[PDB]
Structure formats: structure tokens, C-alpha cells
Amino acid sequence: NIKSAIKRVKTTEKAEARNISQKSAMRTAVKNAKTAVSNNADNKNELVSLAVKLVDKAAQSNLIHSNKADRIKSQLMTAN
Amino acid sequence: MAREFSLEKTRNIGIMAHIDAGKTTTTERILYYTGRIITITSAATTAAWEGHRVNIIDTPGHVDFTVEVERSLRVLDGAVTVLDAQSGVEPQTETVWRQATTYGVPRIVFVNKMDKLGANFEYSVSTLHDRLQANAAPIQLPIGAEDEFEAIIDLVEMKCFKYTNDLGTEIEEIEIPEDHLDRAEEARASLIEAVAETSDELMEKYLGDEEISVSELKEAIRQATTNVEFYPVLCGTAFKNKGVQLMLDAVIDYLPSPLDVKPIIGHRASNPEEEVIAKADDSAEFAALAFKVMTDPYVGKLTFFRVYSGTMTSGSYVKNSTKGKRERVGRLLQMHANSRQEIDTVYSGDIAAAVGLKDTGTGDTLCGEKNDIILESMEFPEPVIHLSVEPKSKADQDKMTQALVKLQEEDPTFHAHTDEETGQVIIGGMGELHLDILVDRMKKEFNVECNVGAPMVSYRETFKSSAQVQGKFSRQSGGRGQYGDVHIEFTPNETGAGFEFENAIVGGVVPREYIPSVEAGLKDAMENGVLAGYPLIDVKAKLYDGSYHDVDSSEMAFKIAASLALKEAAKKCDPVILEPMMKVTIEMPEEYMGDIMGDVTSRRGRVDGMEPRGNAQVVNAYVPLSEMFGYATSLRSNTQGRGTYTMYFDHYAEVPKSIAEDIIKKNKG
RNA sequence: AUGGAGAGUUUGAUCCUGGCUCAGGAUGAACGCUGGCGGCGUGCCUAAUACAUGCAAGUCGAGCGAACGGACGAGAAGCUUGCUUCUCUGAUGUUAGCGGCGGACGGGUGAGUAACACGUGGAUAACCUACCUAUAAGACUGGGAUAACUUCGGGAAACCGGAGCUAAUACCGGAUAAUAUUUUGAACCGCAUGGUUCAAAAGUGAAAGACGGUCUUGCUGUCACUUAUAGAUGGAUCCGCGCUGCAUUAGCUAGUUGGUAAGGUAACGGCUUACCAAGGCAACGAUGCAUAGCCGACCUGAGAGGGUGAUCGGCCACACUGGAACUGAGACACGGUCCAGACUCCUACGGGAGGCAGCAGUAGGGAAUCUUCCGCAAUGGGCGAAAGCCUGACGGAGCAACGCCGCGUGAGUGAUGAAGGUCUUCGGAUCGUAAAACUCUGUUAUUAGGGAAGAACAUAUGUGUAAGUAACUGUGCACAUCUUGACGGUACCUAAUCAGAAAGCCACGGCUAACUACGUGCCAGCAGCCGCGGUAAUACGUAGGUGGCAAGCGUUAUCCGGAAUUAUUGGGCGUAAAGCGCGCGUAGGCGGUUUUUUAAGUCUGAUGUGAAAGCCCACGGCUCAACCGUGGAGGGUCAUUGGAAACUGGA
Numbered sequence A: 001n002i003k004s005a006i007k008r009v010k011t012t013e014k015a016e017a018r019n020i021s022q023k024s025a026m027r028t029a030v031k032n033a034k035t036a037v038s039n040n041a042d043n044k045n046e047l048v049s050l051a052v053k054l055v056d057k058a059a060q061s062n063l064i065h066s067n068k069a070d071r072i073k074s075q076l077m078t079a080n
Numbered sequence B: 001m002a003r004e005f006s007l008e009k010t011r012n013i014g015i016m017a018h019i020d021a022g023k024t025t026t027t028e029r030i031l032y033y034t035g036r037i038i039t040i041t042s043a044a045t046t047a048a049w050e051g052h053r054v055n056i057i058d059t060p061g062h063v064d065f066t067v068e069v070e071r072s073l074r075v076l077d078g079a080v081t082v083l084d085a086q087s088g089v090e091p092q093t094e095t096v097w098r099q100a101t102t103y104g105v106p107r108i109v110f111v112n113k114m115d116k117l118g119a120n121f122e123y124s125v126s127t128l129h130d131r132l133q134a135n136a137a138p139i140q141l142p143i144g145a146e147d148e149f150e151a152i153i154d155l156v157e158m159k160c161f162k163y164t165n166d167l168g169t170e171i172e173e174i175e176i177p178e179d180h181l182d183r184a185e186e187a188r189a190s191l192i193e194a195v196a197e198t199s200d201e202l203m204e205k206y207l208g209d210e211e212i213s214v215s216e217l218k219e220a221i222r223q224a225t226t227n228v229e230f231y232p233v234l235c236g237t238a239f240k241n242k243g244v245q246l247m248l249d250a251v252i253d254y255l256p257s258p259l260d261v262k263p264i265i266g267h268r269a270s271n272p273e274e275e276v277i278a279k280a281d282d283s284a285e286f287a288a289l290a291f292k293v294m295t296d297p298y299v300g301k302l303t304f305f306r307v308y309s310g311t312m313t314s315g316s317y318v319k320n321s322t323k324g325k326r327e328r329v330g331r332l333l334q335m336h337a338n339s340r341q342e343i344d345t346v347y348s349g350d351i352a353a354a355v356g357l358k359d360t361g362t363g364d365t366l367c368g369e370k371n372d373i374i375l376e377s378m379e380f381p382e383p384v385i386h387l388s389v390e391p392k393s394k395a396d397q398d399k400m401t402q403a404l405v406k407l408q409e410e411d412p413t414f415h416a417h418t419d420e421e422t423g424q425v426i427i428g429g430m431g432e433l434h435l436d437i438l439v440d441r442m443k444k445e446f447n448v449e450c451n452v453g454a455p456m457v458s459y460r461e462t463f464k465s466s467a468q469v470q471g472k473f474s475r476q477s478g479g480r481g482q483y484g485d486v487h488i489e490f491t492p493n494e495t496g497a498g499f500e501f502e503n504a505i506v507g508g509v510v511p512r513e514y515i516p517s518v519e520a521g522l523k524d525a526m527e528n529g530v531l532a533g534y535p536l537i538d539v540k541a542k543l544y545d546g547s548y549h550d551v552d553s554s555e556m557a558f559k560i561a562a563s564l565a566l567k568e569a570a571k572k573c574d575p576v577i578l579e580p581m582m583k584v585t586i587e588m589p590e591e592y593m594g595d596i597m598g599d600v601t602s603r604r605g606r607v608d609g610m611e612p613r614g615n616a617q618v619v620n621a622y623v624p625l626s627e628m629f630g631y632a633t634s635l636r637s638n639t640q641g642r643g644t645y646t647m648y649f650d651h652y653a654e655v656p657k658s659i660a661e662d663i664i665k666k667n668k669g
Numbered sequence C: 001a002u003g004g005a006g007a008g009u010u011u012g013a014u015c016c017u018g019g020c021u022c023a024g025g026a027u028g029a030a031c032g033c034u035g036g037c038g039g040c041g042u043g044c045c046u047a048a049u050a051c052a053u054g055c056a057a058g059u060c061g062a063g064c065g066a067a068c069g070g071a072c073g074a075g076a077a078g079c080u081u082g083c084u085u086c087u088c089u090g091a092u093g094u095u096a097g098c099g100g101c102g103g104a105c106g107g108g109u110g111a112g113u114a115a116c117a118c119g120u121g122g123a124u125a126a127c128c129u130a131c132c133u134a135u136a137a138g139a140c141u142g143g144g145a146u147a148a149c150u151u152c153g154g155g156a157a158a159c160c161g162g163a164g165c166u167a168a169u170a171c172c173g174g175a176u177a178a179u180a181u182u183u184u185g186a187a188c189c190g191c192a193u194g195g196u197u198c199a200a201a202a203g204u205g206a207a208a209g210a211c212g213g214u215c216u217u218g219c220u221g222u223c224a225c226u227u228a229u230a231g232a233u234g235g236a237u238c239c240g241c242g243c244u245g246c247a248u249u250a251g252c253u254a255g256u257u258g259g260u261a262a263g264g265u266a267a268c269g270g271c272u273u274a275c276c277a278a279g280g281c282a283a284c285g286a287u288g289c290a291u292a293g294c295c296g297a298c299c300u301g302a303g304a305g306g307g308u309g310a311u312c313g314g315c316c317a318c319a320c321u322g323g324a325a326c327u328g329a330g331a332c333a334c335g336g337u338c339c340a341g342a343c344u345c346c347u348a349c350g351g352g353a354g355g356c357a358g359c360a361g362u363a364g365g366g367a368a369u370c371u372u373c374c375g376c377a378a379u380g381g382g383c384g385a386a387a388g389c390c391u392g393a394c395g396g397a398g399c400a401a402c403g404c405c406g407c408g409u410g411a412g413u414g415a416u417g418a419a420g421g422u423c424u425u426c427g428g429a430u431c432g433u434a435a436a437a438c439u440c441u442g443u444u445a446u447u448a449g450g451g452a453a454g455a456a457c458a459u460a461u462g463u464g465u466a467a468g469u470a471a472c473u474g475u476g477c478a479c480a481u482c483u484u485g486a487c488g489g490u491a492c493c494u495a496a497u498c499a500g501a502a503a504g505c506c507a508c509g510g511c512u513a514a515c516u517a518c519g520u521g522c523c524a525g526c527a528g529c530c531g532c533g534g535u536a537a538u539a540c541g542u543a544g545g546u547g548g549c550a551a552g553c554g555u556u557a558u559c560c561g562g563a564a565u566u567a568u569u570g571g572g573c574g575u576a577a578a579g580c581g582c583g584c585g586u587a588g589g590c591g592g593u594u595u596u597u598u599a600a601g602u603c604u605g606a607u608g609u610g611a612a613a614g615c616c617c618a619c620g621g622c623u624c625a626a627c628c629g630u631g632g633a634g635g636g637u638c639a640u641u642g643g644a645a646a647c648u649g650g651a
């Protein structure tokens, strides 16, 4: 094993933990927003805005691709 | 760069002794002490003692493994002969002593196992004097014997060492006790006389009644030892760590260096008559002798060699002048008590292992590329026991041959050859133990299960009675007609004279064209046995008459006639079976001569004679080769391992009635 | 026009047919014999067999805390003012750790793969792209942790946990910003689907500081950071055509083929799922089996063709076997992770570790293929602002007649045909101008001196100039100076000495250049074919001589040739091998005359491309040559486009 390889193991573990936390958060927000849009609720627009915020922040963190974020936003905002 | 130890400080030694005398204990203690401010493996181990490099080779004791002793003594400078205190000189001690003497190796004797019950230092020295006829004298005395053994009186310095524990530490250097003072002074006088028997200067100095100096007496002992005229005798117990330091001190003080030793003589490859002296000189040309070859599972094939003259660096090219090829010395290793170190260079008087030598067997010379010297090889004893070997599964015969080749390269004393007559492969070794170990190693290491037995004996036939006989073959009934007819007298020839064909034809009754054909037919028919299938020998065939047909006569017809003539001669002449008889020359002490002659006569042999030779006896006898199977073991049992013999085919003799009938029955069915 | 040779052998003899054999070239060759040197190349083709050992991937202190360290130089006199502590200052430096980038390149191998893998030509209005470049706009305001470190506990080791504390160019909240997303309107345009531009709004997150200059903490240089749009680079997908043997493999297919909807992806898409339908492929060879990386090229051939796919370059695939995802711009990752499997190793028996198809090397297999070498000086790459570090890439050296090319092993005179060998017709012939002897040279070799280029630089130091500045330091560019070589004191040059150290292999019956004497006597042996050998052997072995080659020469293996012996070029079927025993007839192949039309074939012009290296032609540089370099020409059954209509095809 190379020293840089061991270091990369550590840093990869850290990055994975952070990324999966953030991705789970954005997935939860997207699911909540989609449910609110599907069944009209007074919280619909605020939930959609939160979903879009987290989707775009994920795209900027590179958790999803820009085109993935665009598809999510397109479907969400067309439903809403 | 610069050798860490000089030629004057280098010591190449070998621990030799009888079985279970303490060679490996002594070597382990030596390595431990040199390695302190222990597994013993490899051909040689390099350590350091008091600023001296010490290469140690531990040898085997068994007469079956005399090849190791031979090949070690060839490249070693000094030897430590270990003796069991309770028994002194034993048969294998005598054997290794004679090998060291034939190689002119200085020796120091070490009486181990002083703590054992029955230990007797004086009796061990007396055995040295009597059994070996060696000018050995003690340079130490043991205070206490068996459990009482607790001090050693060094006699060169008249100083007593007291050992307070079995750990080998906390030795007290004290003055000789008063009660042992007289005995110590008498032993010193005896030692001085023994050395003076070789040194004239010392002899005059002692006769003058003047006091001998410590330095002068050390010098004298060193000179005598290096001349192989004096053996210093020490004592101790390697198991309980007493006397090992003194033994190493004596190794340093008395055993020679590659300088003190006599030079080495070799032959130019292109000028065999030319002689080349290879002295211990770094600046001289590089010449070394490869004395051991093994395979190490980590680093590959190792070639252990001793360098006599010159230097050589790892990662270079050398000449194998014996195989006349070029070898790449890739890596050079030296084995220490606990580890192997890679070493960049090797100097005269160093034993090392090369990694990368291909096709370099033991006894080969490795010389500089430009040089073409060939050092003196090693002579090893001829096989004393032979066994027909054969794989249990014929599908493994190729593996068996390859294993035999590798094993013959590993061990010079083990031989394998195919016998044409019998079509059997035979393996010759130094004894039953040797062959047993080799069989087991083939079975396991090489995964070739083999079975061994007594080698088949090729028998011969002959005619005991003379007779005139005739053979006549006619084949005119069908198609082409063939006629042959011959009249031949068959006579018992003088033993050993071979087949003799005589042509007493008168009047051309047998055309001269067909007579060679008759001879060829007789030869073929006698090659094929007439009684049990073995060739017929010692016969005079006199073709004295015959008939022929101007047309039907043919070479094949006359061959058929000769075949029928030999068939009727075998019917009419009472053939017997002959067996090879070996001229056996047995050498042993006179006290076993009766046993040896009794065994000879019990083997159906006859004692030809006896004769003194040196300090022993020689018995000459003729014994059947069949009855000579397993004779080495019986001889060693009869003579306490002191007896040796040689055998060579001498003539054929008639097999007794019962044995011949048994042969015949076996061959028939 | 640049280019094409045949011979032996079936018979008493002949012509024909027909196979066999030989003369040529080639090689990653192997073996036998032999062996002087130099230059340039090439060197595990077998076991994608297993691997000891060393090295092949790090770097950044000008991102960050901490630790070690201790100049310059403080204080008391031990009365030692030269040695001394801690109460300091502590600079030049070094590091384990967090963090950034790089570990996806470079290097190895050809196992798998018959497939859009590869080659060629196209398309993407179905796509992605870190570092680099250009332009524009920004870099605002706050916060919580954690490594390291200290402490406690458990371990043979691998190393593990509990508690406490601290940084950042690490992480996160908030603010403003969009050509990105939703909706509305408009303009233009295109290869269905749609593309480009403009105008309104709604949802909306980005960022960071480090080292300096001026010092007015205001301005500001370099580097670094963020968003958007372009360029470049790199990657992805699709399509026409081409690219292999077998029918003693004829049926295959059920997410299979299409549609609808959704999910998913950089992206279109049965890519996946639910529903509906029964489609899809196939004698123009589906399916199955076997084998195989493909190409540029290489060998051969007059060509057409045939064979091959080492070295070098491109593309692909793989990294003990199989699956998987993580991080990341990029991997489903040779020297990363997880799981399973096989195998191996260490252990204190509690438990741990590994993957040379990287460079050397070991064992094994094999007829057979090298050093566990030196250096980053050159080129290239990673990191860094830079010096510099790393780089088994690479540059070199070592070994091997393995190949090609070059030069040696002497030259002139030398009849007096010296000795001696072999033959003899006993005269003589021949080895033979060969030798001897006289004269000459030193390529080579030995000795002693001189000794390159490859080296550009970078950095550092001086100026000059250009953008910006309020002005500097800096940045770009230009001109100068110090320094930088593993090879290596090697190539090469000079001076002296000696013909002195340096020739072997095969063949000599015909093919096929080269003949005699002895020994043998169908024996020993030779042999590619025809054959030779039983007393006169140019064929067996030796000797002399001769022939061909020559540091090589022979043998074996394999490919093309000769072979028109699979015949398109360029053969045949009465009797030599070959007409189905003969009809009826399907697909396919082929098809009478004239007129008009189309332009699929056919012919012709232009454009793009067919990488580099290679082959051929020319020139230049190594003293020559091989070799190296530079231009040209060539190479498509290639694509787009414009023309002609006789022939084949269509109407």
C-alpha cells in the first residue's frame, strides 16, 4: 500500500459520509415537495422551493450532475 | 572497499567427530558466543571472535555421509575433532581423522561431554595415542570429572578457570590449586616434551633446564600444529558451557590462516602439465573452488565456494574453467548465526555463496574470465552398496531420471547407472542409510515413489562335456527348397577363453561361402541361451564336416543347421549355469579376520589369502556377486564400522546344483 | 515498359497427364562447428505459470495547527569571563498530522472479445470535459466541529477504543448574481423530433486566502478562489461500408420486435419496469461450434495474390478469479476500498497479511530470449511561485554473431619453381609467388598524452521595453552574466613498437561450381529427389586438390516462390481425375430488335480525408555504409458535390 493510497482511503471515507448525508437530505426534500405538489397543500410552494434549493446545492457540490438537477427541477416545477 | 578482516586474522575451520559427540552443540555454542557482544544452517557460517573472522563448517559423523566431510575438508584450513569423553576415539572419529590427514588439515582435539558419567580425559587422550597413532598432547587439564567437573587448568599459562554455573558466564581466573599444582606441572612438562619432539630449538631450550616463555611455547605449539606434527587436546562440555571460550582461544592461537597453510596447486586448461601456485593474495588473479551446491527456497540456487587467490565482486562475470563456460555472479551472500547478509566482494581465504551460477557443480573451479586455471578437484569414495531402483508407477520414470540427475549433482558420492544386460537402473551409495535417505527424498521432495531391491545378476551358460553333433535342415516340401547340413564338434573351452570357431573342412564339402554364415548362426544361437536363456560362453565349435546342395544351399539354411546343431549339442553335452565371481579384497583390523573369513565362506565364497598391510590386515577372496548383496552392512557390523572392501568381476564359476535348479525354475516360470 | 529462367524422377524407348523433390527470399529463430573488432537495431514467441528481495507515485511550510530545533544576541560569575542555567528574544531549518492537486497519466500484457472491438467514411437538433486560454461579473456577512496533540484502557503484531483541547485555501448557514428551471409574448430558421435570438416576470446557492510593495490598513502585484459564455484538449453514443472457418451446425428469438407511460442516464434508446400487440432475425448463412485482439504495417510474389499482425505508432481489452460501488472532471480504478472464491504466508493461536501481464531477479515450462546495473545531465510527466523532490517513463551502460552494415586478419618484389604433402605413365604434375628472403604500412592491437558535441536552460543577478498603477514591488517580452553530464576521460585526435596476437564452415554423381589416391566391400555408412555401397566407390571415412561463402558457415523448423499444383489474371471433365442414370421444376444466374425517359452500375472534374513512422524517388548528416533527418510520390471497394448517356439496371 502507498502512503497516498492510505490517505486517500481516509479522505474518501470522510467525503462519502458528508456526501451521503447531504444527498439523503436533498432526496428527502425532493420527495416531500413531490408529495405536496401531487396532493395540493398550502405548504406546496415552500416545499418546492426548499427542494429546488437543495437540488441546486447538491448539483454544485457535484453529488448530482447539472443535467440531473435540471431534470429534477423541470419535473417538480412543471408539476407545481 | 577494504576487507573487514585480514588473511592473518581469518580462520576457516570444520567441526568433525563421531556420531553424537557434540558437533552441533559445540557449533551452536560457538555461534552464540561469537554473536554476543542460534540456528545452524547452510554449508558454512561466518562469525567474529576477538577481531578474527571465523568460518565454521559442521560436518556429519555417519560413514554414509563421508562426502560432506570430504568436500568440507577439501576447502577448510583447520579442524576441531570432537570426542565423547567417556569413549574417546570411535570408528568415525578414525575415519574423519584419516580424511583430514590425507588432506593435511591441522587439527585440535576437544573432549566434549566431560560431565557425562564415565567421562575420562586420560582415557580419551590414551585412545588418541593408541587408536589414531597421533602426536597429541593435552594443553589443558580438567579439575573434576562427571558432576565434579568444575574447572580447567590451562597449561600454557598455568592458570585455572573455575566455572560457577552452566550458563557459560562468571568464569573465575584463579591460580592453580596447590593439590593439582604438581599434576599441572607434570602435564606442562609432557606437553613441552611433545612439542620439542618436533622442534629442535625448543628441545635444546628445554634440555638446558631454562624456563620456557609463554610466547615462545605458544609460537612452538602454533608451528607444530600448522605443520600437522602436534595435536593440542582440550576439554569441556558444550551442553553446560564449559571450555568453549578456551576452545575458541585455541582455535585462534594454534589453527593456521590461509597464509600459514600450504599453497594450492592447479593446472592451466591449455597446459595441463603446467603447474600454477595460487597463494592467498588479494592482488593476484581470482581463483576459487565451488565445494557445495544447494537450493534455497527464497534466493534460488546457492553455490558455496572457497576463494583461494584474488578477489571477486558481485554482479560480474567469472569463468568456470572445469565446464569451460561463463557464469554471472549476480549476488554474493554470507550466512551468519541469525541472518544472511549480502556482501559486495569476496577476498582470498573467504567462503561465500554465489547466487546466479548455472551449471556449476561441486568441485568446479571459478577463475577470472581472462585466466584459465583449474584447481585440484576432490576424490570421493566409490559406491559400497548398490540397489536396483525402479518407480512404482512407470509414468514417473522421467521424473525419476530428472531427480536422479539433480541428486547426482547435489551429492558426488551417489551414483546412478543403467545396466545393459539386465536393463535395470542401479543406484550406488555409501551405505544403507545413505540409500534410504535418498529414496525417501526422491519419494517426497521429488514426488517419485520408488521401490528398491537387490540388483539382478546376469548369469552365463557353458558346456561341461564334449560331443560331436550334426544338424540338418531340409525345406524342399513347398515352393523354394532349402538344404543345410553341418557336423560340428562342440568342446568345453578353457574358462575365460571365449567362443572359438574352427573350420576343419576338407574337400569343400561345405562351400567356403557358407562357413561365415555357419559361424554367425552359431553366434546368434549361443547369444540365445540353451538351458535358461543366458548367453553360452567358453565353447570351442569345430565345424569338421557337412553337406550342401548346389542350389538349395543358402546362408539362412546353414544358419538353421548351426542352430539345430547347437540345440542337439545342448541336449547331449550337459550344459551348466555359470555365475559371476567377484575378487573381493577386505581390509580390517586383525581381530575381526576370523569373523570376516567365516562370513566369506558362509557367502559360498572361498578365502584366497591374507596379508598384513600397514597396521591392518587384508583378506582376498572370491565370492558370487549374488551372495555379495548387502555385504557392506555385514562387514561394518562385524568390524564395528572399521572394515572396508572393494570388489571387481574376476571370472565365472559353475552354480551349485540347487541354486542352478532354482535359477532354471524361475526363468522357466 | 524497369517487370516473369528452370531442373530431376513413372518407359526398352516415346509423347502426354500427374504428384513428389530441388535451385530463391525471409525469421524475435534454435542447434552443431567456429569465432577479431566497431556502428545501428533486436532479445520469454512456451506457463494471462507461481513469485523471495529491492525499486516503479508523490509533492506542496508562500493552505493549516503542532512538535523538534536552536543561530543573532540577552542576564549571574561558578572568579572557568567561558562556560552557565531559565527569566527571555529567539532567526536559518526539519518534520508525523489535517488540507490541495496528482495517484484514471506514464509503464505491462493480449487472457477475453467474431463485436460498430478495429479500419475507413459520416452523424449527434440526444451528449459530458479537471488542469490550460480569452472575455465579463464577483470574492459580502457569520458559525460548529475534527485530526494532530495530552490523558486512561486493551494488544505479538496489524493497531484499536474512552475522555479533553485547537487550526485552516477543511466543513456549513445567510446575503447579491444568472443564457441554467417554470410560465407568458414576439422574431427568424431547420435534418420529423425541433434550433437561435429578444422582452417580461416567479422559484435561486457562489467564493478564500497566502506571500509581498506602497503604507495613508487605504490602494495594490503574483498566485490561489467563485459564476457565466466561448476556444482548445480529452472522452461518449449512433450509422454506411470492410473485416473468419465449418451446413458432417437450419432454424433462432419472449424484453425478444414495435407502441404507450414512467423511472433512469452526460446523453437517445427495452437501458429498466407496467400495459397492449405478435412482432424481429435468417440460405444475401440466422443460431451454434471453433479459432482470433484490430490496424498502420511486415515477409513473399512480375503482378494478381498468398502468409503474418515481434520490435515502433494508433485504437481496444485486461490487472489472482468473479461481483460492487466509493472518491473524483475523469475509474466501476495494475502497485485504492468492500464482498465472495482459490492459493499462499506470519502468529504469542487471541488474531493478521498478500497479488511482478511495472523494472531487475527467482523457481518452473521450454530448442530458446539479458543486469536483482548508473542517472534524472537530455525529452516528457506529477507537485510546487520557485530552488527543488519524485519519475525502473526515459537517457545510458552491461550481456547475446540474434540481424543488418562496415573494417580487419597485411602489402610490394619474389623462380632460385627451395624443402615437405598428394598423385604419377617414375619423365614429371600440383599445393605455388604459395613459401623463404629484402622492402613497406599500422587499418587494427599495446603504451603515453590531448579530449567534443549532446547543455537548452530553469533559477539567480543587471538593465531595456509593454498592460495596469496615483507610484512601486511584481508580471509578459528582449538583451547580457555565474552555474548545470549518468554516459565518461567514453567517442575522437596525436606520438612510438611490432606482421607481429586475429579463419572457419560446407560442398565436389546429376540437379550444382568444384576430382584424384588410399581403407571398406550390400558391411560400416550416406541420402533433398533420382539413388549410392557385394574388390576400379569422383556418392561411404580419411588425405591432397578444388568450389562457394567468410566472422561466419552448415542443419532443423515455419511462410511465400518456383506450383498455371484451386488457373479473375491463368487449368480442366470421349479414352489420363472429372457430365448427376434420366426427367418435371422452385430460388438464383443469364437473356432477341427499335424508340423515349431515369442515372443504380459505368465514365469524368472539384473539395475533404486516408495520422506519424514504414516501403519507393530525391537531397542532406554521421570518414563510407547500415542508420538518422527532410521533402515528394504512392496507397479508398472512401465521402460530398458538378457533369456524359453508348452498354448493364429501372420505367
Ligand SMILES: CC(=O)O[C@H]1C[C@@]2(C)[C@@H](C[C@@H](O)[C@H]3[C@@]4(C)CC[C@@H](O)[C@@H](C)[C@@H]4CC[C@@]32C)/C1=C(\CCC=C(C)C)C(=O)O
Pocket (backbone or CB within 6 Å): B058, B059, B060, B061, B065, B068, B410, B411, B437, B438, B441
Ligand atoms: C552436518 C549436517 O548438517 O548434517 C546433515 C546434512 C546431511 C549430512 C544430513 C544427512 C543426509 O540427509 C545428507 C545427504 C548426504 C543425504 C543425501 C542427499 O540428500 C544429500 C544432498 C544430503 C547432503 C547432506 C545431508 C542433508 C545430516 C545429518 C544426519 C542426520 C541423521 C540421520 C540419522 C538421518 C546431520 O544433521 O548430522
Ligand SMILES: Nc1nc2c(ncn2[C@@H]2O[C@H](COP(=O)(O)OP(=O)(O)O)[C@@H](O)[C@H]2O)c(=O)[nH]1
Pocket (backbone or CB within 6 Å): B017, B018, B019, B020, B021, B022, B023, B024, B025, B026, B061, B112, B113, B114, B115, B116, B236, B237, B238, B239, B240
Ligand atoms: N552429557 C552431555 N551431553 C552432551 C554434551 N554436549 C552435547 N551433548 C548431547 O549429546 C548429543 C549430541 O548431539 P549433537 O550435539 O547434535 O551432535 P552430533 O551428533 O555430533 O552432531 C545431544 O543429545 C546433545 O544434547 C555435553 O557436554 N554433555
Ligand SMILES: [Mg+2]
Pocket (backbone or CB within 6 Å): B023, B024
Ligand atoms: Mg549434528
Ligand SMILES: [Mg+2]
Pocket (backbone or CB within 6 Å): none
Ligand atoms: Mg487468445
Ligand SMILES: [Mg+2]
Pocket (backbone or CB within 6 Å): none
Ligand atoms: Mg505466381
Ligand SMILES: [Mg+2]
Pocket (backbone or CB within 6 Å): C333
Ligand atoms: Mg491505481
Ligand SMILES: [Mg+2]
Pocket (backbone or CB within 6 Å): C334, C335, C356
Ligand atoms: Mg503489482
Ligand SMILES: [Mg+2]
Pocket (backbone or CB within 6 Å): C356
Ligand atoms: Mg519482472
Ligand SMILES: [Mg+2]
Pocket (backbone or CB within 6 Å): none
Ligand atoms: Mg528446463
Ligand SMILES: [Mg+2]
Pocket (backbone or CB within 6 Å): C563
Ligand atoms: Mg500460385
Ligand SMILES: [Mg+2]
Pocket (backbone or CB within 6 Å): none
Ligand atoms: Mg476417367
Ligand SMILES: [Mg+2]
Pocket (backbone or CB within 6 Å): none
Ligand atoms: Mg448423360
Ligand SMILES: [Mg+2]
Pocket (backbone or CB within 6 Å): none
Ligand atoms: Mg452411378
Ligand SMILES: [Mg+2]
Pocket (backbone or CB within 6 Å): none
Ligand atoms: Mg504516412
